[PDB]
């Protein structure tokens, strides 16, 4: 059968193939520096003076997903773009975007004060209820 001609080794070029299989390397070093690079996707929250940014960024630096209060779509539906309400809304929007993007796991790396912050707690709860687990699976060796 001609259609049965299959090469001995398969070449899956999808960048997220091994990541989704939980087999890809995730940088285990940087034990003296913060934040840790041992992740495949990181949730990075930037609280500016006026706006709130929430990015899902791959370890290589590519910003896979973004949710900024600076976009019209979001900024035209909330009163203040720098409050706990804004953080919760951007968290829910980012959760929806992550679910439609296929990103279900991330590694959030907040500082102690950021983690203790009410806004960060609300954002984390919003992501969790939106369907994103902020704890990536362990690599399979």
């Amino acid at each position: 059968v001609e259609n049965e001609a299959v090469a001995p080794e398969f070449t899956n070029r999808n960048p997220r193939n091994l990541e989704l299989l939980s087999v890809a390397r995730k940088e285990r070093g940087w034990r003296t520096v913060f934040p840790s690079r041992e992740f495949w996707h990181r949730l990075r929250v930037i609280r500016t003076q006026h706006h709130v940014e929430a990015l899902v960024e791959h370890q290589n630096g590519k910003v896979v997903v973004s949710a900024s209060t600076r976009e019209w779509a979001i900024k035209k539906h909330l009163y203040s773009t720098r409050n706990v309400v804004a953080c919760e809304s951007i968290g829910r929007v980012l959760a929806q975007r992550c679910l439609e993007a296929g990103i279900n796991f991330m590694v959030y790396q907040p500082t102690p004060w950021e983690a203790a912050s009410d806004s960060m707690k609300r954002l984390q709860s919003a992501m969790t209820e939106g369907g994103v687990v902020l704890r990536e699976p362990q690599r399979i060796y």
Partner: protein
């Protein structure tokens, strides 16, 4: 010896005897921001990245923001941390305004551009709503890289691209079983008369996704091209092979990529039926094989090594007796 620096040494311009006068980072946060900016900035020394790496709109937006501020209930909820946002409306407005750029970012991350078009990029200006009809009641949407099982993708999807001559192509980017640099064409509706898709020309009939078992996650892309002027186009796997780069090289002048939507599929039971009945072949089963463990060259006298040293280099665990 002291070779002079090949450029501006860091912390050089700021360095001055007036340390007491100079303001300081009082916060780890500001220090981290500056350090990250510096890391992003290029440098002349070896670094990690080297090796591992209108007015009317403004007026209307200001008026809307002022109206929201004036609305007391909105302010009450904001200060009571109870206000929410309309998620569906936000999604629609994202699609209309800034969805194309974020979708382009997603495609670039997933490698669609580097593979589909060999690097050439394009903003998906036209939103593309594709959904694989699930049952007779619902339908799984294909937004961007989400996961849709081949069971759900068994039957061709409903496409609603809001416009007013279009060509839609489904291409599996990494499902090719013989050629690493090849794709699979699943369904190609060309010369579609606007929004309605049932009137398109069926150049290639719909073949459901068939990601081989243990072959990993496969990415399939819905490419949509606006057709400036109507043009003519030219179950066997050798004829389902398809190089989208060559296809778009042929049809570049009359086609413009204006829509994009992709999803991810892994092996399912329906893949077995696709392979056995539709494709009439023995389904291939792939396994992830890690490289064999490395061991240093065996020494005649493994000094200071445990008794496990010999087991590290024996191949068969069953007892062997040689001549006896």
């Amino acid at each position: 010896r002291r070779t002079p620096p090949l450029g501006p040494m860091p912390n050089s311009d700021i360095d001055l005897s007036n340390l007491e006068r100079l303001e300081k980072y009082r916060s780890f946060d500001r220090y981290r921001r500056r350090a990250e900016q510096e890391a992003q900035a290029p440098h002349w020394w070896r670094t990690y990245r080297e090796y591992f790496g209108r007015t009317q709109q403004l007026l209307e937006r200001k008026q809307a923001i002022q109206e929201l501020r004036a609305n007391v209930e909105e302010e009450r909820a904001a200060r009571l941390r109870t206000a929410s946002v309309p998620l569906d409306a936000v999604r629609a407005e994202w699609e209309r305004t800034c969805g194309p750029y974020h979708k382009q970012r997603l495609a670039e991350y997933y490698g669609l551009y580097r593979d589909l078009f060999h690097g050439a990029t394009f903003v998906p200006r036209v939103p593309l709503h594709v959904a694989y009809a699930v049952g007779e009641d619902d339908l799984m949407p294909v937004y961007c890289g989400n996961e849709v099982t081949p069971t759900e993708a068994a039957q061709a999807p409903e496409v609603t691209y809001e416009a007013e001559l279009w060509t839609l192509l489904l291409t599996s980017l990494d499902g090719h079983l013989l050629e690493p640099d090849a794709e699979y064409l699943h369904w190609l509706l060309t010369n579609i008369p606007g929004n309605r898709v049932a009137e398109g020309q069926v150049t290639c009939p719909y073949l459901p996704p068939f990601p081989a078992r243990g072959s990993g996650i496969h990415r399939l892309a819905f490419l949509l091209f606006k057709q400036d002027q109507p043009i003519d186009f030219s179950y066997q796997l050798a004829q389902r092979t398809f190089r989208t780069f060559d296809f778009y090289k042929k049809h570049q002048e009359t086609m413009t990529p204006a829509g994009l939507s992709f999803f991810q599929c892994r092996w399912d039971d329906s893949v077995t039926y696709i392979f056995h009945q539709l494709l009439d072949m023995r389904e291939p089963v792939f396994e992830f094989v890690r490289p064999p463990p490395y061991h240093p060259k065996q020494k005649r006298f493994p000094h200071r090594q445990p008794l496990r040293y010999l087991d590290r280099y024996r191949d068969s665990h069953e007892p062997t007796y040689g001549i006896y």
